Short mmCIF file of C-alpha atoms and ligand atoms in Angstrom, two decimals:
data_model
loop_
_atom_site.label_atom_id
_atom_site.label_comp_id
_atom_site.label_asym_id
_atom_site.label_seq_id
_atom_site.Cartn_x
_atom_site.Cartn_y
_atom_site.Cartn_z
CA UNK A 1 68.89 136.24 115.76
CA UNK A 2 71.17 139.38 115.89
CA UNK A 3 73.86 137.01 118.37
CA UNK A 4 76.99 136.46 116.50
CA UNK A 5 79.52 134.54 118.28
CA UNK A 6 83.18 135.81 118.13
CA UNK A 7 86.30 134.43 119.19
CA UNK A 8 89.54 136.25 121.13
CA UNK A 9 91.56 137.53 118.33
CA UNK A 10 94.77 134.81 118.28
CA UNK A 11 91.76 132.43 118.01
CA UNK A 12 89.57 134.66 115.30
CA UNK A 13 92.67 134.01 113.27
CA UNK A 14 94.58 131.00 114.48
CA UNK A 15 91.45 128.97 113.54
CA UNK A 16 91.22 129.21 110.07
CA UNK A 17 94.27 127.52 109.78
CA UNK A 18 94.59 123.92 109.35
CA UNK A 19 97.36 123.19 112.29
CA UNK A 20 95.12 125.47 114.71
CA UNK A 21 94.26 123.20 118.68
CA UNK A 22 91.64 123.97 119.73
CA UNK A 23 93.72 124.59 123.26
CA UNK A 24 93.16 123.11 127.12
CA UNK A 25 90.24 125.11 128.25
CA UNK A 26 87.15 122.52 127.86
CA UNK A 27 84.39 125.17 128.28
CA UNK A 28 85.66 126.92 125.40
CA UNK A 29 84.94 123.87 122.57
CA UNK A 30 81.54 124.40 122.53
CA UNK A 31 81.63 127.84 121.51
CA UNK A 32 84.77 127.19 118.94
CA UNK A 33 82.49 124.51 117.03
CA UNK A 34 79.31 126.71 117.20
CA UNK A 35 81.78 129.46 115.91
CA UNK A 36 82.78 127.00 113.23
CA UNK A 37 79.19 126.32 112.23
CA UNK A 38 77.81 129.85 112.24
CA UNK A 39 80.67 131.03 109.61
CA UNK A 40 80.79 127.15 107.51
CA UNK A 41 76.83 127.20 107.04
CA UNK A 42 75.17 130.37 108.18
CA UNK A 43 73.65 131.39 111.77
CA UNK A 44 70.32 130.33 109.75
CA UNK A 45 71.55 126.32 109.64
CA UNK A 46 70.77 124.80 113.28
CA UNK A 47 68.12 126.98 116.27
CA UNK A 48 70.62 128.20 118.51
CA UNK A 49 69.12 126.17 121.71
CA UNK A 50 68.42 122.92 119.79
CA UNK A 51 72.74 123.33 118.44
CA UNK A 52 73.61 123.91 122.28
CA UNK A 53 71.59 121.05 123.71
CA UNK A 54 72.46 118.54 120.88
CA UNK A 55 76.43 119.88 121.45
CA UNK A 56 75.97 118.94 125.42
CA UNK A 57 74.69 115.18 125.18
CA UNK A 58 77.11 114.53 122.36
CA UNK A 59 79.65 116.08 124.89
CA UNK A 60 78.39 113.95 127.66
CA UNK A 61 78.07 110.69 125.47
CA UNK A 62 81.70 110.89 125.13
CA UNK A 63 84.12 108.94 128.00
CA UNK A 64 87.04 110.17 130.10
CA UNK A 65 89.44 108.13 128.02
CA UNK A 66 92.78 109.11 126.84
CA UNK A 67 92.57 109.47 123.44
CA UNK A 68 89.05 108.82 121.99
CA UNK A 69 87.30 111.86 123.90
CA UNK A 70 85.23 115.13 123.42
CA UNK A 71 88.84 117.08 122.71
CA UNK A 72 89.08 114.22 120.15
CA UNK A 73 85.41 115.08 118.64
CA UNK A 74 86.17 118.92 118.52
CA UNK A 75 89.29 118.19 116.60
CA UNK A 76 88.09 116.66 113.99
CA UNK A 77 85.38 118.88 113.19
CA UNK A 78 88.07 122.15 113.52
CA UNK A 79 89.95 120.02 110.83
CA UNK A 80 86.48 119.80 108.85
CA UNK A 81 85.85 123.50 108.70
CA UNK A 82 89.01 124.35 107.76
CA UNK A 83 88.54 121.87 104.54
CA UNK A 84 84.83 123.62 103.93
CA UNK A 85 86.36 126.63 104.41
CA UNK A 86 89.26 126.63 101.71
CA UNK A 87 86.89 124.15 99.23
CA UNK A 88 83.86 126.65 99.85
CA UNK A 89 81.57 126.21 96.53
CA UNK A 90 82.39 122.49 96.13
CA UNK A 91 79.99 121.45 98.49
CA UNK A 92 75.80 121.69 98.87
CA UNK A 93 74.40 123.18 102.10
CA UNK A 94 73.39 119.59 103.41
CA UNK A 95 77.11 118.68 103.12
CA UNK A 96 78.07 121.60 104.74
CA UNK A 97 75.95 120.57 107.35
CA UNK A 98 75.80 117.26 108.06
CA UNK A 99 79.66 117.26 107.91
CA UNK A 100 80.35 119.12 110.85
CA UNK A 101 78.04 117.35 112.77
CA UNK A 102 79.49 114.19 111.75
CA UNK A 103 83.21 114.99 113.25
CA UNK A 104 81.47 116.09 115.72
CA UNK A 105 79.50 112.50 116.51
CA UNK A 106 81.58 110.03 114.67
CA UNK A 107 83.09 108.30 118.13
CA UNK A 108 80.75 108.87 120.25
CA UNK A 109 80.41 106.56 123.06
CA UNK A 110 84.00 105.22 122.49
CA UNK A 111 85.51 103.17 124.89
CA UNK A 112 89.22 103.46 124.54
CA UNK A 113 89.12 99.89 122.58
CA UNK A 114 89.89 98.70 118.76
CA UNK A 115 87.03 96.87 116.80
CA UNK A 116 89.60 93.82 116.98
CA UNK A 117 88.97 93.84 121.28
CA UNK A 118 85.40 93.64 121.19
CA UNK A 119 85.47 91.05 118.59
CA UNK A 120 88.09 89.14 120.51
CA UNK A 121 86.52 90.16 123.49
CA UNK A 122 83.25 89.13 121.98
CA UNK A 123 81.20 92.20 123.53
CA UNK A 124 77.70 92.41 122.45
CA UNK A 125 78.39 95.36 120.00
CA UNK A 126 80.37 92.87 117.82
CA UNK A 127 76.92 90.26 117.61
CA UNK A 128 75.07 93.24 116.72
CA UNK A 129 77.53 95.04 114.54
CA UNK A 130 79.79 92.62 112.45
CA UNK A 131 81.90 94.81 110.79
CA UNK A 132 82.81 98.74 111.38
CA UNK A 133 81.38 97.33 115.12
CA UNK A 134 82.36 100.83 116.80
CA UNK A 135 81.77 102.89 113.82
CA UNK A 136 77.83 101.54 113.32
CA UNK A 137 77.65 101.93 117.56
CA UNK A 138 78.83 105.89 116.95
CA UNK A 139 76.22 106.36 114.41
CA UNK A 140 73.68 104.63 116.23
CA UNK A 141 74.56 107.14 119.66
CA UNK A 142 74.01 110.03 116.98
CA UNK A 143 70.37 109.21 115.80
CA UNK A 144 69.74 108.51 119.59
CA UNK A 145 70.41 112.00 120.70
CA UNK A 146 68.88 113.64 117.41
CA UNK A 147 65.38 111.60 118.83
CA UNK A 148 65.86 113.37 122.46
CA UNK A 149 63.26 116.10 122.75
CA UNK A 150 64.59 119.66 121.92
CA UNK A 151 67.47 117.96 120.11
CA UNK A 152 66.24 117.49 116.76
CA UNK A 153 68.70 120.13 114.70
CA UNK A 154 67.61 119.02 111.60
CA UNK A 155 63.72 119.58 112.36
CA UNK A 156 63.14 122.71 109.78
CA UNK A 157 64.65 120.05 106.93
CA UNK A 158 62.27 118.51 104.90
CA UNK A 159 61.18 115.06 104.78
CA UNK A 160 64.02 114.46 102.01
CA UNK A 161 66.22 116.52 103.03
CA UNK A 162 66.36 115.21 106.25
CA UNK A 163 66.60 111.43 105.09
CA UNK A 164 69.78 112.73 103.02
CA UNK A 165 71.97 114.42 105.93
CA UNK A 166 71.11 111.20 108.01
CA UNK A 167 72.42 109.19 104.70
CA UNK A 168 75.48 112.01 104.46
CA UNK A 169 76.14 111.65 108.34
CA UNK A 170 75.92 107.39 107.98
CA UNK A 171 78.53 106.82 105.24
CA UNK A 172 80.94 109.80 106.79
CA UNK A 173 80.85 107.96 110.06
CA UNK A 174 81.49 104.51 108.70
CA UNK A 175 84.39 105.70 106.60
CA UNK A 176 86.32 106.83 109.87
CA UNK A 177 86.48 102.63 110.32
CA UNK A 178 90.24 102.94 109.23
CA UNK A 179 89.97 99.24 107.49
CA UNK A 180 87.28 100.86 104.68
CA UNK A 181 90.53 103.53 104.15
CA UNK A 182 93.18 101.87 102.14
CA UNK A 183 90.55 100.49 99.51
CA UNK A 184 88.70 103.90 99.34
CA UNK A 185 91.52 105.89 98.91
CA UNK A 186 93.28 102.87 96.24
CA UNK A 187 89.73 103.73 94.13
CA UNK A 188 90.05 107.55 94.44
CA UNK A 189 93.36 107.23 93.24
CA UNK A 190 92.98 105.40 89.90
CA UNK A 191 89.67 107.73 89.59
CA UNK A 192 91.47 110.67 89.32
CA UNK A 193 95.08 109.22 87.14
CA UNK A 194 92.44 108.20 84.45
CA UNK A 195 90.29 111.15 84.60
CA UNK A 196 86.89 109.29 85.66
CA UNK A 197 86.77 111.37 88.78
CA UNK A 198 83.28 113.06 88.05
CA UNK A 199 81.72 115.31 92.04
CA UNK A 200 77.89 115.00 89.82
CA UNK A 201 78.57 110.73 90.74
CA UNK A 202 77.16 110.61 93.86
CA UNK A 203 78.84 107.44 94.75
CA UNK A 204 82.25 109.32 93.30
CA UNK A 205 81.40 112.61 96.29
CA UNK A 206 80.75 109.47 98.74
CA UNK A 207 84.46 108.09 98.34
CA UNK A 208 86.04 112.13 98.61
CA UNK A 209 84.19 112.79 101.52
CA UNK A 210 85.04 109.19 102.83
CA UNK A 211 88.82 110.35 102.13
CA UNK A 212 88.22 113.81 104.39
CA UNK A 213 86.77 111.45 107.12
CA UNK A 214 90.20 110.07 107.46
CA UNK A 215 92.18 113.03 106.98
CA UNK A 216 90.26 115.16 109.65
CA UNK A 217 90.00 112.08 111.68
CA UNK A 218 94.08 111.78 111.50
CA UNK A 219 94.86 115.44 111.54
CA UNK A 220 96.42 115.04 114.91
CA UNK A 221 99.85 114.38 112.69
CA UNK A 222 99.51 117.76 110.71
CA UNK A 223 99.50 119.83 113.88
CA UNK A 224 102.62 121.58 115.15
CA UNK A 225 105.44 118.98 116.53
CA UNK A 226 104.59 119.52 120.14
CA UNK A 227 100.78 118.92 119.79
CA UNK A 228 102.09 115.66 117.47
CA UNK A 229 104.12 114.51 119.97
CA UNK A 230 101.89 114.87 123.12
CA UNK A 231 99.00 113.24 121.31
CA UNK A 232 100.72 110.20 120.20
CA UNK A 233 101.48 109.80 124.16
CA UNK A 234 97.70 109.55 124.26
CA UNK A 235 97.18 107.71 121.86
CA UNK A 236 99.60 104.33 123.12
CA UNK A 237 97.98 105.17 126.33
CA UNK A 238 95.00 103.74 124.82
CA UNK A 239 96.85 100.78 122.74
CA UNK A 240 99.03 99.71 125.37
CA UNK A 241 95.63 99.28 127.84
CA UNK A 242 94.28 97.14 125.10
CA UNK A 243 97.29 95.48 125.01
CA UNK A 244 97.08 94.61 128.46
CA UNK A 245 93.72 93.34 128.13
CA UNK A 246 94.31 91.08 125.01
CA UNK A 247 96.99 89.47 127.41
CA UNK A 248 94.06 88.88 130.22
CA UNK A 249 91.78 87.00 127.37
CA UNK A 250 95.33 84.93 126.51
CA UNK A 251 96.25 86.48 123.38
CA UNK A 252 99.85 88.39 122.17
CA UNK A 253 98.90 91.56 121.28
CA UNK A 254 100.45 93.24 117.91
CA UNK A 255 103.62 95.13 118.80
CA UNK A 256 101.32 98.38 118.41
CA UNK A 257 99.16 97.37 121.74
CA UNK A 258 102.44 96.21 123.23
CA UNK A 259 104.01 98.48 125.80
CA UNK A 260 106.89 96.21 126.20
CA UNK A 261 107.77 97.89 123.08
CA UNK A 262 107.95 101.28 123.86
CA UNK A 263 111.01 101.67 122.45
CA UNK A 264 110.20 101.50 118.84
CA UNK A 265 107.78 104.06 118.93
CA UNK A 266 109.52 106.04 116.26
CA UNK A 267 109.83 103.41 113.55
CA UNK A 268 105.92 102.62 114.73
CA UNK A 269 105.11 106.24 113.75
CA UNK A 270 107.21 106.13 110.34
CA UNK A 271 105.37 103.00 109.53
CA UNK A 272 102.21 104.81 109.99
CA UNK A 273 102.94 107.82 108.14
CA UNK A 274 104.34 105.97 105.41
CA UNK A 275 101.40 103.20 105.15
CA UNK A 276 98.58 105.58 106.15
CA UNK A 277 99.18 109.53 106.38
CA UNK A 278 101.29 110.39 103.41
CA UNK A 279 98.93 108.52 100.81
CA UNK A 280 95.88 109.82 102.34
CA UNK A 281 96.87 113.62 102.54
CA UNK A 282 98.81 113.16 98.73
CA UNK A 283 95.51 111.61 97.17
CA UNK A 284 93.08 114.43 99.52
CA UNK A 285 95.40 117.34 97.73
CA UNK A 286 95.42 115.73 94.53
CA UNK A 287 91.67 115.82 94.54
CA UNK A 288 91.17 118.87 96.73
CA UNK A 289 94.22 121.60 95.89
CA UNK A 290 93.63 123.47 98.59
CA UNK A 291 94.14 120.83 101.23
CA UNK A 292 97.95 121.58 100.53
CA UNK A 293 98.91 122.60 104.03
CA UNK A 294 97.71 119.10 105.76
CA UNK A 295 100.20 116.79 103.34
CA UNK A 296 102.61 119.31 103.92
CA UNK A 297 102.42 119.45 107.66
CA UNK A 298 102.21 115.77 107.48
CA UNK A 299 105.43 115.65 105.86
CA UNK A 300 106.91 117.86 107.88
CA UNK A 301 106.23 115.62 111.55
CA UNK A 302 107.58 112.58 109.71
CA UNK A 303 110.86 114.74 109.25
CA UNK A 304 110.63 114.96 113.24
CA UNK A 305 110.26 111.07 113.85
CA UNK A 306 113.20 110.51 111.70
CA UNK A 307 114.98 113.00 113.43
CA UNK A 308 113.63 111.31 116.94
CA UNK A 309 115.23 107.87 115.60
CA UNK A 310 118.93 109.68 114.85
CA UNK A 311 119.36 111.17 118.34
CA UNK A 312 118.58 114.88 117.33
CA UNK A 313 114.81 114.78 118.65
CA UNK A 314 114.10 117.99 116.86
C1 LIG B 401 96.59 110.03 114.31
C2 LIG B 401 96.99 108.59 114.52
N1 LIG B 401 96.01 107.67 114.26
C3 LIG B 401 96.28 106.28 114.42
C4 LIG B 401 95.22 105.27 114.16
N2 LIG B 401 97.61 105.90 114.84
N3 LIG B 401 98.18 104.67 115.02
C5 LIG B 401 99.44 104.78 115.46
C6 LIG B 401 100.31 103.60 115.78
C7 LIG B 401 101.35 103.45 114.68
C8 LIG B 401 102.18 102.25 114.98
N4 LIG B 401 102.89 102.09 116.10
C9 LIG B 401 103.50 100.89 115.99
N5 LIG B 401 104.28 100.32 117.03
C10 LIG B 401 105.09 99.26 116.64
C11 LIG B 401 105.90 98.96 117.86
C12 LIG B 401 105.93 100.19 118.69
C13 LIG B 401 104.91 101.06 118.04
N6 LIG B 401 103.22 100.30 114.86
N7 LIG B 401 102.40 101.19 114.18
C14 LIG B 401 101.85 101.04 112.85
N8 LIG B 401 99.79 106.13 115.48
C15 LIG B 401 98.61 106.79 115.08
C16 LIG B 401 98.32 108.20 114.90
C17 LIG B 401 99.46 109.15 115.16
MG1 LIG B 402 86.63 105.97 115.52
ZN1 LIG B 403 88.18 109.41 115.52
#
């Protein structure tokens, strides 16, 4: 009751910041998100034991794979907190909440492969799941480990109350289904350049917290240029694997899930911060100003795969 956690001091500070990783020592992310929950909600939000047990399945639901992982899971949700954290009275304690716990959930069970492979692939998630196949599978993991005894977080919620972080928790995880992006953030766009843009809509706070989905879930470009660097590495890993395997089924893989072309990983990149990045961090600091640092930091990795393309490298 009286058991605050605290963090080394480089950490205490280092992770209030938006760039902060979350660093190589495994048995230390558990603490960091618990940290992150304790100061985002209140020691009062989640029993201590029912937080710990619910943060070891999810931990244990997630696979060994390059990219998609528990370090993966952690990240997002530091990138969460640090957008509660600067956007403090915006948001209801259920949001708060079920937020956190969302990055926290929202791949569980990932298998290293695109929505596109297990449709091609035609693995049973994609009969069950037609669209968002992965996206409905990670929420589905989520209410499955909330339904293991001792693991029910949410138990001193009310009937209501409960429902609605489920609800909050649903659409958050969905929205991380990177096809559902470029039409949310379109609509959030011409919301706020003709002043509809009204947080009392419900269906209006659904889109912005659709839009942080995305922008936590990418924040792996707004970290500092080694961390950018080292995680694309991981993240081809994965493509290129699934680019191997769309050859075994008979099928050309796009160039992204093609490690015979390694060598235009830089103009890949631009593409993607051009197409995808940029106009999601713009419209998230347009909506929410303090958010600043994540466009800028955005910005500023671009400047490094430019400078990768002209022979400087940084
Ligand atoms: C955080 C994050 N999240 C996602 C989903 N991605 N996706 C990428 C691939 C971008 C890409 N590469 C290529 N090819 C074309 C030929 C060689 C490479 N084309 N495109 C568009 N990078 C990321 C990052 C950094
Ligand atoms: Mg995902
Ligand atoms: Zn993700």
């Amino acid at each position: 009751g009286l058991m605050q956690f605290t963090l080394p001091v480089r950490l205490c500070k280092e992770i209030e910041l938006f760039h902060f990783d979350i660093g190589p020592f495994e048995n230390m992310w558990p603490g960091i998100f618990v940290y992150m929950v304790h100061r985002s909600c209140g020691t009062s939000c989640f029993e201590l034991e029912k937080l710990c047990r619910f943060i070891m399945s999810v931990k244990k639901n997630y696979r060994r794979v390059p990219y998609h992982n528990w370090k993966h899971a952690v990240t997002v949700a530091h990138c969460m907190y640090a957008i509660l954290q600067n956007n403090h009275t915006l948001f209801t304690d259920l949001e708060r909440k079920g937020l956190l716990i969302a990055c926290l959930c929202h791949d569980l069970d990932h298998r290293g492969f695109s929505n596109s492979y297990l449709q091609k692939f035609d693995h049973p998630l994609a009969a069950l799941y037609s669209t968002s196949t992965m996206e409905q599978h990670h929420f589905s993991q989520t209410v499955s480990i909330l339904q293991l005894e001792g693991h029910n977080i949410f138990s001193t919620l009310s009937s209501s109350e409960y429902e609605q972080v489920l609800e909050i928790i649903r659409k958050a995880i969905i929205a991380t289904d990177l096809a559902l992006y470029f039409g949310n953030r379109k609509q959030l766009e011409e919301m706020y350049q003709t002043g509809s843009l009204n947080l009392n809509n419900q269906s209006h706070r659904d889109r912005v917290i659709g839009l942080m989905m995305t922008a936590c879930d990418l924040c792996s470009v707004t970290k500092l240029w080694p961390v950018t660097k080292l995680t694309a590495n991981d993240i081809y890993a994965e493509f290129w694997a699934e680019g191997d395997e769309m050859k075994k089924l008979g099928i050309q893989p796009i160039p992204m899930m093609d490690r015979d072309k390694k060598d235009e990983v830089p103009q890949g990149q631009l593409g993607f911060y051009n197409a995808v990045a940029i106009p999601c961090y713009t419209t998230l600091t347009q909506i929410l100003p303090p958010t600043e640092p994540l466009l800028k930091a955005c910005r500023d990795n671009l400047s490094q795969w430019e400078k990768v393309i002209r022979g400087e490298e940084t």
